[model samples]
Target: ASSTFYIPFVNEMGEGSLEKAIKDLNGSGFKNALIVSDAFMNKSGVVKQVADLLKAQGINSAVYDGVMPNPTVTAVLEGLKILKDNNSDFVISLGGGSPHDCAKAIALVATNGGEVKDYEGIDKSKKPALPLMSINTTAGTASEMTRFCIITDEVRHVKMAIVDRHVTPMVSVNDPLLMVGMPKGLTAATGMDALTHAFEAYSSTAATPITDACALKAASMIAKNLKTACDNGKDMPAREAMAYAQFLAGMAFNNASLGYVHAMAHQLGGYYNLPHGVCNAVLLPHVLAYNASVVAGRLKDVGVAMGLDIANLGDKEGAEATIQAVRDLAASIGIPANLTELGAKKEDVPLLADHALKDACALTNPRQGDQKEVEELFLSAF
Candidate 1:
């Protein structure tokens, strides 16, 4: 029961790959597509350009540009309805995790006939979702290829993770040409999200040989290229490397699952309605420290993966170096000092910890925590 590597059927990466990916779908006679994107992509006219391409290929499309920063259950339901009313043949998810996540839930519910919450755990669906084509605009989350969707349940103040094979896209498109336009703030946040993915997968309870290869490679690339991508914005090589890095990270975390870093970070995002990547960055170093006591060897590997100079060092020392490197990198990228600055009050730590205990991501964390330890982690991050 604890096996299976799910990915998009067709993954196309590197520079200028989006067109060919879309052409592949067009050649298959997919007449109508539901293009799901957030306001940023739509406002930037990326959505319209994609629509023009689809139209040129004789495929009519309806645009759903209502996706938010962190998508909600309501967003997913709305996208599904749009797809249904348009009688769309397939879906095109254009943007980062939000659009793709919204599209995945839409595709799943469109084919499976149920609420998004019904398939919260692993592989809960009985059939493949509507054939989806993902066009990624961000270098992190890699939702373009992975069968992972995180939708916020606003009413309950929880982020629902829908990990199912049925939601995997038919084709994944990563065009660096489309990615260079992201501003500094978004670039840093999403880049850190990719780093979190690689670190968590490398330190996951279920890490496989394949996942290690992907995770390590991703960490190295992110360590080297993230700042350039964040600052310069127009650097094509950095952009392309980050695009590959996040996809590789996605491959790692998609199979191995995540850890307490994500488990706790999800609570922060849901409770405060904050940015997911920033919350993950703030909590990552502390969680790494907590896990280092037992997973020092893995943490040492994390140091090497991130390209740290830790020659002949023992596990504890290497882990310390690795965490230091993470702190340094996070600061360089302009992440805030603590969660308190991001509106996380100390009084809410108990509630956040309680929810983290129940989070599905916590199952794969190397170290276990009771309510007390989880609260301490929140305090430490502060």
Candidate 2:
């Protein structure tokens, strides 16, 4: 079988990458920018900082700071209207996943002449999105660089997965300087999200050698650095390591795809308006245990990547150890213990499972399950 890898045309990482990215934009001939972000970012002056930087490059920018935790289709439409009103030729996603996903949808619809819902499935867009430059403020999701864009549809109460090649940003910027201000909870949740990405991609049915290398390396780096980064948000070394770790995880999952953890998490995120990473963190170990019947060996490999001493253990024992390690990490980082803790209702399990089965990420799961089994998995999490 053959595989193709996808990423941004240009990726800038480490310290000063944000400035580098903005400076590089100076002579790119982009006249206007639609800066997609949240109110928090706007209030914190991050939006103004970016706008000032763009102004230095002789570019005008419009601010659409309505993006929330889970970006809604309504938010995308609002941003699109701002883009059109401002005559923005390009977009700058100035925050994490929410802003990036919202910006991608806005940019895609700006050129494709339709709503965000029309491009929900894989590669549904006919034209490239208006050139986007994603400046990531968080380490998880990797929405800054990945072709995946997740938007919540308020009408249907489902998170629409807009997995399209056209959504891939032209440039991705990850600077530790931008990450130092992240709150402890956000740091912990996003770090766990990165770990989930590595694990799911490693266990994916479509995993390849390139993705395997990236996944294992990401797992190890995250295991070493996540706690430190969360414990002290100002630790530049830990922050930089996490930046690389999450980006490597992104590289792994973006091409190798994900499993039921993401599929189910997306549903919970849509239904309950829960945080994406927290949902993934709560569900990851449960889904891994469910998959262990078939992919115990792969889970054992994940244990090794997480720096567990499982060499003397059989595949089943190693897989158990891997799941336990994940639980311990989540606990250490203050992740909720179960779905119930995250305010997920028992009654919603059936509906969440139904939607999970239809999720595009479920296609690459190592072990497929029927609706009853998936509901059982969801119930187990509760």
Candidate 3:
């Protein structure tokens, strides 16, 4: 079997690389850019900073700061409207996963000529999206670079998993300077989200050697750096390590895809309008436990990468250790204990399970389960 990899050709990382990203975009002759971001980015004056930088290089920009944490089709349409109204030639996503995801949806629909909902599933768009450059603010869902663009449908209350290659960014920027402002809670949530990405991709049915290497490396780095980053937001070293770690995890999942943690987490996110990474942090251990019977070896590798001394343990015991390590890390980082803590109602588990079963990410789970089993997992998390 053959596997293909997808990533932006021009990627910038480290302390002050956002400048390099903007310079490259300016050189590309994109005159008008639609800067998609959330209210916080605009409030912090990052939007003005980016626009100012663009102006210095003879580029122009429009700002759309309505992107919510759970990006909705409503937000997508609104941003696309701004893009079209301004006759923007390109897009700049200037925040964490939400802004990036919203920007991808807008850029995709701008060229594809339809609502964002039309491109919900894998490779649904025929034409490439408007050129997009993502400037990441959080060590995040890694939506900044990945082909995956998740949007919520307000009416359906489900996250539309838009897994299309056409939505890949033209450039990805990870500058720890932008991330240092993240509050402790956001840092913890996004760090755990990155860890979840690494572990899920490692255990994915479609895992390749390349993805495995990236996943393992990301797992170790995240285990070492996430706590430091959370405890001290000003720790640039920890922030930089997390930035690279999440991007490495992005490389893994961008090709290998994800598993039930993402599938179920999406449902919880759209239903409750909760934080994306927090939901993933809460559900990752449960899903891994469910997958342990079939992917115990893979889970054991995750344990080792998490720096657990499981050298003499059997596969099952190692898998248990892996889950325990995840629990401990999540606890230390202030992730909510379970679904109930996150306000997920027990009565809705069946409905959430039904949607989880239909999510595109569910396809790559190593251990596929029936509705009853999924509900059982949800109950356990609850």
Candidate 4:
């Protein structure tokens, strides 16, 4: 029986739940906490908000606000230093994907011996990470709940995915009120990242019936509501829908795994410091097209989820429709259509393809691609 589902033991979501969630954490018996956060949230007073809440709860906490777009091994170590210095008993990641992902790395290394790279691949951690809660301010990535941690190896400039169940959060708090603060560009980009997660999971070789249901549902909800949510951040219905959509996408990818979009995008983010979602968005169509040759039926399911009128279409036609739908949804949400606009140089394809082929997440991709084919895929993006 090769089936299981993992989630934060306490999963909470509501419109005005942030404060309540903190209030409840008061009873978790934690001592000092290391608040893994971003410069954006810190400068904007959200970190202070968390600090004040901890004060009310009589729990001491400090903030590490240096997380970047793609968190790196160096950043994780820096955050871990803060935890060690403060003698923190737990970690609270208080931002979007980057902070939560960085927090997972920091927490993992706090207990596991040696470097973060030592814990790469699946279930390699011998001990559970420090108690961690992820309070998300973004609607995508869903790092708040998943065991998947993507960290950049600065030396190699590649995204390392650490798939350890022990890194799962203790609590996942997603309050739409918290997400209302997102700006337009971030809203579009992160939302598309959620869409890409759903698409990649649905088409992956490791996909199961459970993940299939979740991924297709997530894709549909995102297709229907992401534009509205991106345009109007305070729309409660749209916000709630996005929260669930991203979470379901997380459920799919966190278990069934991902494809080349994330594996290749990790390189772009690690090497060029580009936004993770934009890189995934730009690469999704090209990668999906490549996978279509072998998994056209899977792509056809994606087309059906996107509401393409394809009752008479075969898998090949439906597969093309799926690709077109992804392109259209991405375009409608203001994502760049190609990697050229994303500053990826043609000269880097050979190196990127080499590193991408070694990325752990790519193992689950439906199609097996060699270095030359992967390089061709990147060039096709250009």
Full-model lDDT for every candidate: 0.89, 0.92, 0.91, 0.87
Winner on lDDT between 2 and 4 is 2
Candidates 1 and 2, the one with greater lDDT: 2
Model 4 lDDT per residue over 1-382, tens place:
3877777898788787778888997777987989999898999899998999888998999889999877889999999889889999999999898899899998889888878899888899989998888998888888999998888887885567788898899889888878888887888888889988998899888888989999999988888889998788889899888888888898898888898998899788767778887899889999989999999988898778867787579999989888988898888878997989998899999999988898777998999989999999999998
Q: Report the candidate with higher lDDT, 1 versus 3.
A: 3
TM-scores for candidates 1 onward, in order: 0.96, 0.96, 0.96, 0.93
How much lDDT does candidate 3 score? 0.91
Model 3: CA > 4 A from native = 156-158
lDDT (10s digit) by residue, model 1, range 1-382: 3667778778998886887777765578788899999987899899999998888888999999999988999998889888989999889899988898999998888888689889998789998888898999888888888888888898887678787888888889999999999888888888999999998999998999989899999999999999999889999999999999999999999988899998999888877778888999888899999999989888888788778988579989999999999999999989888898888899999999999999888999999989999999889889
Residue 233 lDDT (model 3): 95
TM-score, candidate number 4: 0.93
Clashes of each: 0, 0, 0, 0
Off by over 4 Å in 2: none
* lDDT ranking of the models: 2, 3, 1, 4
lDDT of 4: 0.87
Clashing pairs in 3: none
- Over 203-258, each residue of candidate 3 has an lDDT whose tens digit, in order, gives 99899999999999999999899999999999999999999999999999998999
Alpha-carbon RMSD of each model: 1.5, 1.5, 1.5, 1.9
